[PDB]
Amino acid sequence: LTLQKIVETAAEIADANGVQEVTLASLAQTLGVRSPSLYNHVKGLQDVRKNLGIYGIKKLHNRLEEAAEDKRMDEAIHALGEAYVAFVRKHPGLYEATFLRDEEVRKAGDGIVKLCLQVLQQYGLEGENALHATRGFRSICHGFASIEQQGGFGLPLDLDISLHVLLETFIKGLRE
Amino acid sequence: IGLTLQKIVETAAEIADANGVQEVTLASLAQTLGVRSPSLYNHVKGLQDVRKNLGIYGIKKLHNRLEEAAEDKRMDEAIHALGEAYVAFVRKHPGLYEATFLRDEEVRKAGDGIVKLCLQVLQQYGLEGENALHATRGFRSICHGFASIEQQGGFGLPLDLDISLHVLLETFIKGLR
């Protein structure tokens, strides 16, 4: 039993059943262990949620780094957006956990902002425009993934095409 | 003021905005109205019916703010006014906006007016049919994503939020043109 095992279990419960289904009893039950032993690693349920949020955002970051590896500019942006949305599709509970209003959860997302900013600086932008563009890119990916997840894209059109079109429009606007 | 469906819906809206859509129940409705639970059944079938009517009301309220914002504006002026109005609605009505996502045909149907408005502006850039439809999704994604992140407190950078939103709108517009 480690903090990591506990957190990986919380992740599977969260994706399959909803993040609100993560409890110490459900974790102990699933790991086949007595619940008091969880307290050698976590302070309680809120502490579990914190760690789950940090784990989620690190796993997202890993997917994004992988997708963008040895790609530049347009290909990197497309692969980043695609991987962002794929992450939300397959890990809804883990993704939801990254939005815990906790300063450690927030800070663990900094590698994602840096990666985005690094790719966006390849576009040779003025003043603060690199910095606005990271908010822009994050808004696009969260926006698309969130509407799609909630069933708000009712039109018959292919969603993978729609995402590609949105990313291309963003890229075109960055190029001028 | 005798009890009506519209009052029940307006009560649900205030509850949702204050405490979240999840706080909207027959019991919370009954207790805030100072009335009891069979009285609500004269006007609503039950909570799904409340949720549906709440979703329609919120969508209609959002649509109105957007129609007003875009009036006598075209192209860039319209896009900027539309996006600003969308996000402003989310800031002011977080729970009502959440309600508009109910998976129900009547709720979806009432949201067609917004998609139609966006499509009409995007066609001014010479976008046609299918590709214009892809662009509506993009614009909704931008507005929803920005507002949703702002609301969760996810914009930590010491950048002005009004500027960031409209810089994104500028970039989107340039990418259409």
Short mmCIF file of C-alpha atoms in Angstrom, two decimals:
data_model
loop_
_atom_site.label_atom_id
_atom_site.label_comp_id
_atom_site.label_asym_id
_atom_site.label_seq_id
_atom_site.Cartn_x
_atom_site.Cartn_y
_atom_site.Cartn_z
CA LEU A 1 0.00 0.00 0.00
CA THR A 2 1.34 3.40 -1.07
CA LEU A 3 -0.18 6.82 -1.66
CA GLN A 4 0.24 6.06 -5.40
CA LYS A 5 -1.84 2.86 -5.30
CA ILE A 6 -4.54 4.66 -3.36
CA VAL A 7 -4.61 7.47 -5.90
CA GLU A 8 -4.64 5.09 -8.93
CA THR A 9 -7.59 3.27 -7.37
CA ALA A 10 -9.37 6.62 -6.77
CA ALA A 11 -8.83 7.33 -10.48
CA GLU A 12 -10.51 4.11 -11.71
CA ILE A 13 -13.43 4.56 -9.33
CA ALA A 14 -13.80 8.20 -10.46
CA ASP A 15 -13.87 7.44 -14.20
CA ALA A 16 -16.22 4.45 -13.95
CA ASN A 17 -18.58 5.71 -11.23
CA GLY A 18 -18.16 9.49 -10.84
CA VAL A 19 -15.65 11.36 -8.69
CA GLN A 20 -18.35 11.80 -5.99
CA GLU A 21 -18.22 7.98 -5.59
CA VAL A 22 -14.66 8.15 -4.25
CA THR A 23 -14.79 7.41 -0.49
CA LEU A 24 -12.30 5.84 1.97
CA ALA A 25 -14.70 2.89 2.38
CA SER A 26 -14.93 2.36 -1.39
CA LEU A 27 -11.11 2.65 -1.70
CA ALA A 28 -10.48 0.22 1.17
CA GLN A 29 -13.17 -2.12 -0.16
CA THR A 30 -11.58 -2.05 -3.67
CA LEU A 31 -7.96 -2.47 -2.49
CA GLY A 32 -9.18 -5.23 -0.13
CA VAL A 33 -7.68 -3.51 2.91
CA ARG A 34 -8.92 -2.23 6.29
CA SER A 35 -9.69 1.50 6.07
CA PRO A 36 -7.59 2.66 9.07
CA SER A 37 -4.44 1.68 7.14
CA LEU A 38 -5.32 4.37 4.53
CA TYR A 39 -4.42 6.97 7.18
CA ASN A 40 -0.73 6.02 7.01
CA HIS A 41 -0.88 7.70 3.56
CA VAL A 42 -3.82 10.14 3.43
CA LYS A 43 -5.38 12.46 6.05
CA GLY A 44 -8.88 11.73 4.80
CA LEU A 45 -11.20 12.12 1.84
CA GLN A 46 -10.35 15.74 1.03
CA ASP A 47 -6.65 14.76 1.02
CA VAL A 48 -7.51 11.91 -1.37
CA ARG A 49 -9.34 14.38 -3.69
CA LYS A 50 -6.30 16.72 -3.63
CA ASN A 51 -3.91 13.96 -4.57
CA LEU A 52 -6.30 12.64 -7.23
CA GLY A 53 -6.38 16.17 -8.77
CA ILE A 54 -2.58 16.37 -8.86
CA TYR A 55 -2.39 12.86 -10.33
CA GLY A 56 -4.98 13.77 -12.98
CA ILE A 57 -3.28 16.91 -14.15
CA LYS A 58 0.13 15.15 -14.30
CA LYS A 59 -1.37 12.35 -16.39
CA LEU A 60 -2.92 14.98 -18.74
CA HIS A 61 0.46 16.75 -18.94
CA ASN A 62 2.12 13.42 -19.83
CA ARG A 63 -0.35 12.78 -22.65
CA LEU A 64 0.23 16.34 -23.96
CA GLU A 65 4.05 16.04 -23.82
CA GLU A 66 3.82 12.68 -25.63
CA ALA A 67 1.52 14.04 -28.36
CA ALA A 68 3.65 17.13 -29.02
CA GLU A 69 6.97 15.23 -29.00
CA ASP A 70 9.08 16.05 -32.08
CA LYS A 71 6.28 18.15 -33.57
CA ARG A 72 6.43 21.87 -34.18
CA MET A 73 3.84 24.60 -34.80
CA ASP A 74 0.66 23.42 -36.58
CA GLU A 75 1.24 19.71 -36.12
CA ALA A 76 2.06 20.22 -32.43
CA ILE A 77 -1.10 22.37 -31.85
CA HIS A 78 -3.31 19.77 -33.57
CA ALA A 79 -1.77 16.89 -31.65
CA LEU A 80 -2.05 18.81 -28.35
CA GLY A 81 -5.74 19.65 -28.86
CA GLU A 82 -6.52 16.10 -30.04
CA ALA A 83 -4.81 14.56 -27.00
CA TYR A 84 -6.49 17.03 -24.65
CA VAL A 85 -9.95 16.04 -25.87
CA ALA A 86 -9.06 12.31 -25.92
CA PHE A 87 -8.03 12.58 -22.29
CA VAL A 88 -11.37 14.15 -21.30
CA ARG A 89 -13.25 11.46 -23.30
CA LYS A 90 -11.58 8.50 -21.60
CA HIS A 91 -10.96 9.99 -18.14
CA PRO A 92 -14.02 12.10 -17.23
CA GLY A 93 -13.62 11.61 -13.43
CA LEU A 94 -9.91 12.19 -13.36
CA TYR A 95 -10.43 15.35 -15.50
CA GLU A 96 -13.20 16.60 -13.21
CA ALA A 97 -10.82 16.13 -10.22
CA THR A 98 -8.25 18.57 -11.72
CA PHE A 99 -10.76 21.36 -11.02
CA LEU A 100 -10.56 21.01 -7.25
CA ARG A 101 -10.16 24.56 -5.85
CA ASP A 102 -6.83 23.70 -4.22
CA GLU A 103 -3.55 25.52 -4.71
CA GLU A 104 -1.43 22.33 -5.02
CA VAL A 105 -3.81 20.97 -7.71
CA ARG A 106 -3.51 24.28 -9.57
CA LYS A 107 0.32 24.42 -9.37
CA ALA A 108 0.71 20.87 -10.66
CA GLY A 109 -0.87 22.16 -13.93
CA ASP A 110 2.02 24.60 -14.53
CA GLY A 111 3.91 22.14 -16.79
CA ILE A 112 0.88 22.30 -19.13
CA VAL A 113 0.90 26.12 -19.35
CA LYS A 114 4.70 25.97 -20.03
CA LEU A 115 4.38 23.37 -22.78
CA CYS A 116 1.61 25.43 -24.50
CA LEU A 117 3.60 28.65 -24.16
CA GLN A 118 6.72 26.94 -25.63
CA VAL A 119 4.81 25.71 -28.70
CA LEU A 120 3.05 29.09 -29.07
CA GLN A 121 6.31 31.09 -29.01
CA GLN A 122 7.18 29.31 -32.33
CA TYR A 123 4.50 31.59 -33.84
CA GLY A 124 6.57 34.75 -33.14
CA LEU A 125 3.95 36.84 -31.34
CA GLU A 126 3.91 40.43 -29.97
CA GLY A 127 3.92 41.59 -26.30
CA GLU A 128 1.56 39.56 -24.13
CA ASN A 129 -0.01 37.71 -27.11
CA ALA A 130 1.83 34.46 -26.28
CA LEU A 131 0.31 34.62 -22.81
CA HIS A 132 -3.25 35.36 -24.04
CA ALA A 133 -2.84 32.51 -26.51
CA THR A 134 -2.34 29.92 -23.75
CA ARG A 135 -5.70 31.02 -22.23
CA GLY A 136 -7.11 30.84 -25.75
CA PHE A 137 -5.78 27.35 -26.41
CA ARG A 138 -6.94 26.08 -22.99
CA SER A 139 -10.39 27.66 -23.55
CA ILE A 140 -10.75 25.94 -26.90
CA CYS A 141 -9.82 22.47 -25.64
CA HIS A 142 -11.82 22.63 -22.39
CA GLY A 143 -14.71 24.28 -24.22
CA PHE A 144 -14.98 21.66 -26.96
CA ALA A 145 -14.43 18.70 -24.60
CA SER A 146 -16.94 20.00 -22.07
CA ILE A 147 -19.79 20.65 -24.54
CA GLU A 148 -19.19 17.25 -26.19
CA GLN A 149 -19.19 15.47 -22.80
CA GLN A 150 -22.54 17.13 -21.84
CA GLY A 151 -24.19 16.24 -25.18
CA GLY A 152 -24.38 19.84 -26.45
CA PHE A 153 -23.11 19.07 -29.93
CA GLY A 154 -26.42 17.91 -31.39
CA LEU A 155 -25.62 18.49 -35.09
CA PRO A 156 -24.95 15.35 -37.22
CA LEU A 157 -21.43 16.59 -38.14
CA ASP A 158 -18.37 14.55 -37.25
CA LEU A 159 -16.87 15.81 -33.99
CA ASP A 160 -13.25 14.93 -34.82
CA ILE A 161 -13.58 17.04 -37.98
CA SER A 162 -15.15 19.88 -35.92
CA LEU A 163 -12.24 19.85 -33.45
CA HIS A 164 -9.70 19.88 -36.33
CA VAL A 165 -11.56 22.86 -37.96
CA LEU A 166 -11.55 24.80 -34.67
CA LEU A 167 -7.82 24.17 -34.11
CA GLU A 168 -7.00 25.14 -37.71
CA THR A 169 -8.98 28.38 -37.42
CA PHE A 170 -7.04 29.21 -34.22
CA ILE A 171 -3.71 28.41 -35.97
CA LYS A 172 -4.64 30.49 -39.05
CA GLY A 173 -5.46 33.44 -36.78
CA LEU A 174 -2.05 33.01 -35.05
CA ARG A 175 -0.18 33.02 -38.39
CA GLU A 176 -1.99 36.32 -39.18
CA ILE B 1 -49.93 36.35 -7.36
CA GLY B 2 -51.57 32.91 -7.64
CA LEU B 3 -49.03 30.09 -8.18
CA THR B 4 -48.04 29.32 -11.80
CA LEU B 5 -45.54 27.34 -13.84
CA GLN B 6 -43.59 30.53 -14.66
CA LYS B 7 -43.23 31.49 -10.96
CA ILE B 8 -42.09 27.93 -10.14
CA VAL B 9 -39.49 28.24 -12.93
CA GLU B 10 -38.28 31.71 -11.76
CA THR B 11 -37.94 30.31 -8.19
CA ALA B 12 -35.95 27.33 -9.56
CA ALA B 13 -33.68 29.86 -11.40
CA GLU B 14 -32.89 31.82 -8.21
CA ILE B 15 -32.19 28.60 -6.29
CA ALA B 16 -29.96 27.31 -9.11
CA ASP B 17 -27.99 30.57 -9.38
CA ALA B 18 -27.50 30.71 -5.62
CA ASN B 19 -26.88 27.10 -4.75
CA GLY B 20 -26.45 25.20 -8.05
CA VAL B 21 -28.94 23.30 -10.23
CA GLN B 22 -28.49 20.29 -7.90
CA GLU B 23 -30.13 22.26 -5.13
CA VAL B 24 -33.31 22.49 -7.22
CA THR B 25 -35.69 19.85 -5.90
CA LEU B 26 -39.45 19.62 -5.35
CA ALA B 27 -38.69 19.97 -1.58
CA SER B 28 -36.50 23.10 -1.94
CA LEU B 29 -39.06 24.60 -4.36
CA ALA B 30 -41.95 23.90 -1.98
CA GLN B 31 -40.06 25.29 1.03
CA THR B 32 -38.92 28.56 -0.63
CA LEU B 33 -42.41 29.19 -2.08
CA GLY B 34 -43.89 28.55 1.40
CA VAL B 35 -46.40 26.20 -0.19
CA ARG B 36 -46.54 22.41 -0.24
CA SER B 37 -45.73 19.62 -2.62
CA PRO B 38 -49.08 18.62 -4.11
CA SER B 39 -49.60 22.30 -5.00
CA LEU B 40 -46.60 22.14 -7.36
CA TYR B 41 -48.19 19.18 -9.18
CA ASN B 42 -51.00 21.38 -10.46
CA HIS B 43 -48.36 23.09 -12.61
CA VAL B 44 -45.51 20.57 -13.06
CA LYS B 45 -45.33 16.85 -13.72
CA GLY B 46 -42.33 16.53 -11.38
CA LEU B 47 -38.65 17.48 -11.14
CA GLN B 48 -37.64 16.41 -14.66
CA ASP B 49 -40.46 18.70 -15.85
CA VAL B 50 -39.07 21.52 -13.61
CA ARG B 51 -35.54 20.89 -14.98
CA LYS B 52 -36.81 20.94 -18.59
CA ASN B 53 -38.73 24.19 -18.14
CA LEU B 54 -35.74 25.71 -16.33
CA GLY B 55 -33.42 24.74 -19.21
CA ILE B 56 -35.80 26.34 -21.73
CA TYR B 57 -36.09 29.50 -19.61
CA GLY B 58 -32.29 29.79 -19.29
CA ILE B 59 -31.71 29.22 -22.99
CA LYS B 60 -34.36 31.82 -23.82
CA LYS B 61 -32.79 34.29 -21.41
CA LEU B 62 -29.32 33.69 -22.92
CA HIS B 63 -30.71 33.98 -26.47
CA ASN B 64 -32.30 37.38 -25.62
CA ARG B 65 -29.00 38.83 -24.26
CA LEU B 66 -27.24 37.63 -27.41
CA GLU B 67 -29.92 38.95 -29.81
CA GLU B 68 -29.78 42.38 -28.09
CA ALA B 69 -25.94 42.43 -28.18
CA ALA B 70 -25.77 41.68 -31.90
CA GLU B 71 -28.54 44.12 -32.99
CA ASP B 72 -27.37 46.39 -35.85
CA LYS B 73 -23.87 44.97 -35.62
CA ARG B 74 -22.16 42.94 -38.32
CA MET B 75 -19.03 40.81 -38.64
CA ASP B 76 -16.34 41.71 -36.03
CA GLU B 77 -18.53 44.06 -34.01
CA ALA B 78 -21.22 41.34 -33.77
CA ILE B 79 -18.74 38.55 -32.93
CA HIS B 80 -17.21 40.61 -30.08
CA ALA B 81 -20.56 41.72 -28.71
CA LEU B 82 -21.91 38.14 -28.94
CA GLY B 83 -18.94 36.58 -27.11
CA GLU B 84 -18.94 39.27 -24.41
CA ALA B 85 -22.71 38.81 -23.84
CA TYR B 86 -22.32 35.02 -23.64
CA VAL B 87 -19.62 35.13 -20.99
CA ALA B 88 -21.40 37.94 -19.08
CA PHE B 89 -24.51 35.74 -18.88
CA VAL B 90 -22.47 32.87 -17.44
CA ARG B 91 -20.91 35.26 -14.86
CA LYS B 92 -24.33 36.51 -13.80
CA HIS B 93 -26.31 33.27 -14.12
CA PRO B 94 -23.99 30.31 -13.37
CA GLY B 95 -26.78 27.89 -12.32
CA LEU B 96 -29.20 28.96 -15.00
CA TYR B 97 -26.49 28.46 -17.62
CA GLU B 98 -25.72 24.97 -16.24
CA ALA B 99 -29.50 24.20 -16.62
CA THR B 100 -29.33 24.80 -20.40
CA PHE B 101 -27.28 21.59 -20.81
CA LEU B 102 -30.15 19.25 -19.82
CA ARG B 103 -30.37 16.39 -22.32
CA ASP B 104 -33.96 17.02 -23.55
CA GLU B 105 -35.38 17.73 -27.02
CA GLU B 106 -37.38 20.77 -25.90
CA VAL B 107 -34.24 22.31 -24.26
CA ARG B 108 -32.12 21.55 -27.37
CA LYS B 109 -34.89 22.85 -29.61
CA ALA B 110 -35.03 26.17 -27.75
CA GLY B 111 -31.22 26.45 -28.17
CA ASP B 112 -31.51 26.32 -32.00
CA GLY B 113 -32.23 30.09 -31.96
CA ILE B 114 -28.72 30.70 -30.63
CA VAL B 115 -27.10 28.42 -33.22
CA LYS B 116 -29.14 30.20 -35.91
CA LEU B 117 -27.97 33.63 -34.73
CA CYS B 118 -24.30 32.53 -34.71
CA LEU B 119 -24.63 30.93 -38.13
CA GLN B 120 -26.12 34.15 -39.59
CA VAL B 121 -23.18 36.23 -38.36
CA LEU B 122 -20.59 33.64 -39.47
CA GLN B 123 -22.12 33.58 -42.96
CA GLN B 124 -21.22 37.32 -43.22
CA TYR B 125 -17.59 36.15 -43.46
CA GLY B 126 -18.66 34.18 -46.55
CA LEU B 127 -18.89 30.84 -44.72
CA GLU B 128 -21.39 28.42 -46.20
CA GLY B 129 -23.42 25.42 -45.03
CA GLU B 130 -21.35 22.63 -43.45
CA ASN B 131 -18.16 24.69 -42.82
CA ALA B 132 -20.31 27.49 -41.35
CA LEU B 133 -21.80 24.84 -39.06
CA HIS B 134 -18.34 23.69 -37.94
CA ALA B 135 -17.60 27.35 -37.12
CA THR B 136 -20.69 27.62 -34.90
CA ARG B 137 -19.30 24.76 -32.79
CA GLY B 138 -15.98 26.58 -32.59
CA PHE B 139 -17.53 29.82 -31.43
CA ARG B 140 -19.63 28.03 -28.80
CA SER B 141 -16.55 26.14 -27.66
CA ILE B 142 -14.59 29.37 -27.25
CA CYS B 143 -17.34 31.08 -25.23
CA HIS B 144 -18.21 28.08 -23.12
CA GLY B 145 -14.55 27.18 -22.46
CA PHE B 146 -13.46 30.67 -21.52
CA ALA B 147 -16.46 31.27 -19.23
CA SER B 148 -16.24 27.77 -17.66
CA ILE B 149 -12.53 28.16 -16.86
CA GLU B 150 -13.04 31.72 -15.48
CA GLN B 151 -15.85 30.49 -13.23
CA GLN B 152 -13.72 27.62 -11.84
CA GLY B 153 -10.92 30.14 -11.15
CA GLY B 154 -8.52 28.49 -13.65
CA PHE B 155 -7.05 31.67 -15.13
CA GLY B 156 -4.16 32.35 -12.72
CA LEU B 157 -2.05 34.56 -15.03
CA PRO B 158 -1.99 38.26 -14.05
CA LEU B 159 -3.64 39.10 -17.37
CA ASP B 160 -6.79 41.13 -17.82
CA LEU B 161 -9.68 38.71 -18.52
CA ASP B 162 -11.61 41.15 -20.79
CA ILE B 163 -8.46 41.49 -22.95
CA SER B 164 -7.77 37.71 -23.11
CA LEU B 165 -11.34 36.92 -24.18
CA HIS B 166 -11.32 39.46 -26.99
CA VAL B 167 -7.79 38.61 -28.14
CA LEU B 168 -9.09 35.02 -28.51
CA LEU B 169 -12.13 36.41 -30.40
CA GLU B 170 -9.76 38.42 -32.66
CA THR B 171 -7.71 35.29 -33.39
CA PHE B 172 -10.79 33.22 -34.22
CA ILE B 173 -12.10 36.02 -36.53
CA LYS B 174 -8.71 36.30 -38.31
CA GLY B 175 -8.77 32.51 -38.82
CA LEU B 176 -12.15 32.70 -40.54
CA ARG B 177 -11.09 35.63 -42.79
#
